Amino acid sequence: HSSGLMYTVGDYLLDRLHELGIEEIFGVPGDYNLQFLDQIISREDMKWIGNANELNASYMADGYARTKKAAAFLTTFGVGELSAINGLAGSYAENLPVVEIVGSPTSKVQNDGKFVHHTLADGDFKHFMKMHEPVTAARTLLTAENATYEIDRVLSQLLKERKPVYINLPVDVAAAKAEKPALSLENTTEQVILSKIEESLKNAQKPVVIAGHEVISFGLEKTVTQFVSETKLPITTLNFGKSAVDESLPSFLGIYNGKLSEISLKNFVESADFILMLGVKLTDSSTGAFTHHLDENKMISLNIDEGIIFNKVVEDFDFRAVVSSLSELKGIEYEGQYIDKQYEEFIPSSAPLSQDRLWQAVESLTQSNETIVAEQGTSFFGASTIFLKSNSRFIGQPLWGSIGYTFPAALGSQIADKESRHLLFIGDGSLQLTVQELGLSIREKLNPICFIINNDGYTVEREIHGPTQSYNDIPMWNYSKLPETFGATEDRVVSKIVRTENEFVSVMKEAQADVNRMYWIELVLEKEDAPKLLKKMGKLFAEQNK
Amino acid sequence: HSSGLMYTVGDYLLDRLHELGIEEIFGVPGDYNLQFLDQIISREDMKWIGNANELNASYMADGYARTKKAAAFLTTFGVGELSAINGLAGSYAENLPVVEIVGSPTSKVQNDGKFVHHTLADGDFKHFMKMHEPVTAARTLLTAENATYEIDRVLSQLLKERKPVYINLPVDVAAAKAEKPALSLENTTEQVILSKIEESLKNAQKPVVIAGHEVISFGLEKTVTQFVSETKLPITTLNFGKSAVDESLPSFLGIYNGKLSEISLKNFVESADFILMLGVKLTDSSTGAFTHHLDENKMISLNIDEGIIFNKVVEDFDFRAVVSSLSELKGIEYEGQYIDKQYEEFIPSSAPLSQDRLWQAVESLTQSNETIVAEQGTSFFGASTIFLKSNSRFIGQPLWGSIGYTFPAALGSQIADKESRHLLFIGDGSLQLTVQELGLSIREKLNPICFIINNDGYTVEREIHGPTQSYNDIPMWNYSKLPETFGATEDRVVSKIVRTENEFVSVMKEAQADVNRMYWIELVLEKEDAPKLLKKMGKLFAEQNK
Numbered sequence A, B: 001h002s003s004g005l006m007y008t009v010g011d012y013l014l015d016r017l018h019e020l021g022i023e024e025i026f027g028v029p030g031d032y033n034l035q036f037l038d039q040i041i042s043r044e045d046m047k048w049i050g051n052a053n054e055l056n057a058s059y060m061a062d063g064y065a066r067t068k069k070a071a072a073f074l075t076t077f078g079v080g081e082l083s084a085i086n087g088l089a090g091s092y093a094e095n096l097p098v099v100e101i102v103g104s105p106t107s108k109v110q111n112d113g114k115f116v117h118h119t120l121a122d123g124d125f126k127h128f129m130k131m132h133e134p135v136t137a138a139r140t141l142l143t144a145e146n147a148t149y150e151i152d153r154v155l156s157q158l159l160k161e162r163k164p165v166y167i168n169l170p171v172d173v174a175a176a177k178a179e180k181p182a183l184s185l186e187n188t189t190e191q192v193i194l195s196k197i198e199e200s201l202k203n204a205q206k207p208v209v210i211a212g213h214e215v216i217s218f219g220l221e222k223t224v225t226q227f228v229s230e231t232k233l234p235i236t237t238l239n240f241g242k243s244a245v246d247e248s249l250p251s252f253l254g255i256y257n258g259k260l261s262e263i264s265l266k267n268f269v270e271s272a273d274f275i276l277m278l279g280v281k282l283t284d285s286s287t288g289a290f291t292h293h294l295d296e297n298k299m300i301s302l303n304i305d306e307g308i309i310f311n312k313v314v315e316d317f318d319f320r321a322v323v324s325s326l327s328e329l330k331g332i333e334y335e336g337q338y339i340d341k342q343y344e345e346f347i348p349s350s351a352p353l354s355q356d357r358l359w360q361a362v363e364s365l366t367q368s369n370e371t372i373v374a375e376q377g378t379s380f381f382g383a384s385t386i387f388l389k390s391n392s393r394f395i396g397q398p399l400w401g402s403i404g405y406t407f408p409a410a411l412g413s414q415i416a417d418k419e420s421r422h423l424l425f426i427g428d429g430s431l432q433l434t435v436q437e438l439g440l441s442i443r444e445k446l447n448p449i450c451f452i453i454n455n456d457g458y459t460v461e462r463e464i465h466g467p468t469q470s471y472n473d474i475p476m477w478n479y480s481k482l483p484e485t486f487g488a489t490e491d492r493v494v495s496k497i498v499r500t501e502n503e504f505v506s507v508m509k510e511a512q513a514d515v516n517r518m519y520w521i522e523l524v525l526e527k528e529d530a531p532k533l534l535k536k537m538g539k540l541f542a543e544q545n546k
């Protein structure tokens, strides 16, 4: 005790999760996990945060992982885990270190092949773990005898790859005896790679660094930011991995998005005589539909799974090790110019809100130490090109792209870092998939600033195909009235409807000033209105499907 | 004259769905399915009914299948299909004929291994179909060259087993040329079975029939009802398959649920000298936690996959064929007694609503031509033992048991049969998983009667374990205000809060009398209050988890 005044498998697991920095566990109870839940409740250093549904729990855990750099959620066998599998798939796709723990029937029930609830009534308790094979780095069915080694095996894999892992925990196994862990869970080619990077950087007249999502996966953002700061090297990111570095840096160019990039940025990146890519993956939504021009012959790329050193593929290295050794490199100093930064100002008028002006306003009015979360749709494509201020972060999901993700994810990330004010931009159509976590936000007294873009349906879809087709319409809810209906009082959530630029600036400033309440702001915009980037990208998506 | 002088694969699929009796398709759009969606919208013989999310779509299609006897829903590759997989799993477990169509990228994009949205950025477009293997009777990734062959193969499997099937439809393949279908979608073992059943019923002094969920799967309820009506044979069902026969039959005994059965029913079933089981599976929730006593030595059981004739296993037979020939059997009339019908007139008072009184009232007030839908929790436990009136049906999901299922499922079933008044009983905890389909119910102008049991959290869980544990609490929404907030007007949805027995009788009668609006009724019950059946199963589950 600070004042100076049987251990089980459940305790072992929770101890290991604590070691990973996890302070909150998400999910949904079921009879197959209640005993383990008791253990979570009893922890002084860990809080149960129950969700309305499992899909939302999985999304929330993903957002938490993006910020905390590890996460866990708990589901029940079959119905819980299968509800959550799309969330876990997104965590696999975008490489987030999420542990799913699945409570399962007792070892005896499983061995007896009983036709119990949440099964296919065939006596087989292994189907659902098999179904997770493509979306997990490691998976285990625990037994009393295997539990400590298996837990350590799968969580060690979480540490190695920062991809999701899966632990099936039978009821009787969680209560089984265990011994406390004795030890914590925590170079030639790597030195050759570093030497070639050093040589290349010092000989380059116009180097450029491109940072991506795998930097975020490993919590290497501050490391890369420090490296770029010290060396003055020009740096860009894709929108997949936005905020992999601090965007306030004088050498940060903007977001490279293939032919849809700002022209000076495009020209700079594509004329660089050496390119260092750190944790980047080139996807349709992050390359202007594969219209990038990045010359492999002038490139060293480093990824979790492999590196390419001027076309020579290598696999025998640790990504984290190499990236963290970059500031061992001395004497690198870029002495050239970057690109002209446009002056950021927003003066509101009484005009109705438009998409392009909205994102100009958000860019101006966003502060340091904030996290911007932006949903697939007009929100992602608008918010993705805003220059973030110092110590600010971004969460977007351009590879997996599962609409609805951002609402629970924003809440999870907000819980992970309560000192970073979260601003959520989510469309009406996307909010409808995951709205029920409003209850959690109220109960947990979270204070994010949430902007709901009511444009009367699926505007991004209208831009790709069928602008006046009925399937792009959705039932219109009274979005501003949701918090009240879900149990919020005025001292917890402030709700607003905003139609004009003046109203937007007033409410945004009001929200930013008032750090002790959540803001729920319904923005009204025209269905035909799309930000410039999406007007272009919509047609490229359409072309990709021809 | 005085002088003497483009049908496509998408069309083919939709024509086949029409053949199955499907008039509505559920789901959620995405760029990979929008062009196929145009084809649905253009159909005169079926309607697109867009959902808020895909999990709910899959639930809705399941409910539709239970009543319509076939169903389909449409998702987008990766994100849509994985969101829906828990619903499809439930359709597999409880054997409902649901077709999931997944719109996927063009074959060129798939063949090139492009890192496109809704993938793991590994160029592999086959992971998600593989993940469906354990929960689908058949599956296909269509090509232009195999499309009609594969559609017919998988839909023929749906007709054979009445289990869910899966069709991945690439954008370019749906638009590919096709020819209209040339053929329509379509022994001694069976004679021996029928002869042995006939013989056994002739020799029995006290036969009992047990009908189960596979009767519902094949749309054989009327067939079984007719057979039982003609022969006067005693019949029971489990709660798994409730309404597999019409419960208004003179020879219908009630629900057999192991040692939790009503005593005279239990005694009758367990002393029967011959047992004929039709489409039954014995599961924990449907056997009083495996406390049934059904002697295989006195039993012929018929299932879709298997028959057991006095311990002798048979496979080579058509379940539907055999059941449909039962009325051809001769000399099998039952001339004995059944069990006594207890009667008490329900007399309401001003007393606050309690669980056992609630279900007493519902039994007294339920009418012919209704479908009762009951969610896992106190609703299922209470509602499952109500005697249904003539031409009335029941939907519950005791094997898969995915809470939230029943709200979209009730709406889907209600769309499937507009002439059966659906009464939904769903708990507060469960409604929170799937509440967003309230928008669809308003748009489609459905008129179900919905009862939301507000008992301030997960009462069934409190009965299993941890009655005062915080994980059994949920954020309390203002449930009665949901329709207004989701855009309903008073000409569409009537919302009420009900606290007393008098209020309940008044509102239920009011609801039943007003066929032209939807009713949204918040029932207030105490968290500690459980129906008498649950006061028993609560413990049995707890024991099962020891």
Ligand SMILES: Cc1ncc(C[n+]2csc(CCOP(=O)(O)OP(=O)(O)O)c2C)c(N)n1
Residues within 6 Å of the ligand: A375, A376, A377, A378, A379, A401, A402, A403, A426, A427, A428, A429, A430, A431, A453, A455, A457, A458, A459, A460, A461, B028, B029, B030, B031, B054, B076, B079, B080, B083
């Ligand atoms: C789970 C899931 N279902 C469907 C899609 C396809 N999809 C992408 S964007 C989009 C529309 C989003 O609309 P909204 O949130 O209203 O954004 P807007 O463009 O109108 O601002 C849809 C349906 C998806 N990406 N994920």
Ligand SMILES: Cc1ncc(C[n+]2csc(CCOP(=O)(O)OP(=O)(O)O)c2C)c(N)n1
Residues within 6 Å of the ligand: A028, A029, A030, A031, A054, A076, A079, A080, A083, B375, B376, B377, B378, B379, B401, B402, B403, B426, B427, B428, B429, B430, B431, B453, B455, B457, B458, B459, B460, B461
């Ligand atoms: C998808 C899913 N998650 C979790 C469970 C476990 N579970 C079974 S019943 C139940 C509680 C349902 O509570 P409620 O709907 O409020 O019913 P009641 O209070 O009337 O018992 C839970 C969480 C489940 N069956 N399915």
Ligand SMILES: [Mg+2]
Residues within 6 Å of the ligand: A377, A427, A428, A429, A453, A454, A455, A456, A457, A458, A459
């Ligand atoms: Mg919208």
Ligand SMILES: [Mg+2]
Residues within 6 Å of the ligand: B377, B427, B428, B429, B453, B454, B455, B456, B457, B458, B459
């Ligand atoms: Mg409840």
